Amino acid sequence: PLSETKCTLKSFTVEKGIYQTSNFRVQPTESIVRFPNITNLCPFGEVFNATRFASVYAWNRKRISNCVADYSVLYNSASFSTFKCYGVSPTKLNDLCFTNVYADSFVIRGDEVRQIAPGQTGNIADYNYKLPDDFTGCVIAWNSNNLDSKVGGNYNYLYRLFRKSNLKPFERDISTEIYQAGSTPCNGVKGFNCYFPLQSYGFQPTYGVGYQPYRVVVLSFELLHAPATVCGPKKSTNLVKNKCVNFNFNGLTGTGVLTESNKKFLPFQQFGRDIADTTDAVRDPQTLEILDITPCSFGGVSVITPGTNTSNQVAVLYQGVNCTEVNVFQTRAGCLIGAEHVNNSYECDIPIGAGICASYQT
C-alpha cells in the first residue's frame, strides 16, 4: 500500500500526510440465474421447413411469446443460402429475454434481397413491407429455386408494383383491387395511362438470379418489462442471499448483493426502481417472493504514512465502510488499520477527518 502511493505520486519519496490511491470494491463470488421451468418449445424449425410461405405483402406471421425460445436447433451457421443478422446470432440470443416474437415468412426475388432491410427503401419495401428500424433480429434467406419455381413462372405468389402511397414499416395492405398507378386517377378499371397495381412473380427454375425465388424468414423481437419464465439451459440456480453475486432476474442482468426486504408490490407490478431509475427490487419469476437488489460494497482507499525519511509504517484508511473480515479500528470516516488509538488529545498532525488526526509517535 505504501508503493501504491509511490506510483500515485510518481515518485519514490512519499511526503508526510494522507494520500488517496485506489478504490476497493467487492467482486461477485457467484452467479445466480433464477427462472422457472420451461413450458414448451418455439417452432423454430417449423417456420423454415414450412411447405410454402405467403407473398411479400401477404406475409404470414407466427407470434411466440415468453422467451427464451428453443435454442437447441440453430440453423444460423451455413445451413441456408443467405444469413444476415443484427445484434447477436440466435446462439447468443439464448441469454436474452424478450417479450413477444414475430416470425415473418415471405418469398422475394433475386434483385429484391437488397430491398429487405430495416430503415431501407425499395420496390417491395415501400409498396409491400418494410422492416422497422428497431429490428434486433436476424434476416434469414434460402434459395427456393429448386422448389417454389414452376415452369412458365409461378403465379401463386403476388406482389404490388404500384400504390398511391408508400407503406410505413410494419404495415399490411392485402388489397388486390385496381387502384391509381400514376399521378392521374383512372377511376377503377385499368386504363387511361394507369397500370394494374398487383403483379405475379415470374419464378422460372431455368432463368438467372433475378427470377429465382428466395424464401425469407424475419424474426421480429420485442423487449419489454414483462417477466420471462425461461432463460438458458440453467433454470433454478438456487438462490443465495447476503452475498455479492451476479444476478439475472426476469431478464435483468446485473451484479449486486441479494437481500430480502419487506417492500410490498402490487400483483401486476414485476419490479421497482430507485430515484436513479435503476433496478431496486425484483420479484421471483419462479415462486412468489420479493428480493431487494443491494449494491455491493465499495469505497475509496486512503493511505496514512509519515515521510519516506521518517519510517516505513503505513496506516491504511478505508472510506465509509465497516471492516468485518480483517490494529483494526473504526472511526466516523471508516475502517482504519495499521494505527493505534490514544485516548489523549494532541495537536493535529495528519488529519484523518471527523475531528480525528493521525501522528507518528512512540
Partner: protein
Amino acid sequence: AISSVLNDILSRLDPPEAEVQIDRLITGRLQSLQTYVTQQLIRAAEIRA
C-alpha cells in the same frame, strides 16, 4: 445510444459493434462529469470569497 444500461449493449450487439455504442455513453457521461466539475470549481470560488 440504443440503451443507457451497460449490460444491454454487451448482451445485444457484438463486441465490435458494442464498442461504438459504449463510446457514445463514455463521451456523454464524460462531458456530463466535466460539466459538474466545472460548476463546482466556479462555486468553490464564490464560497471562498
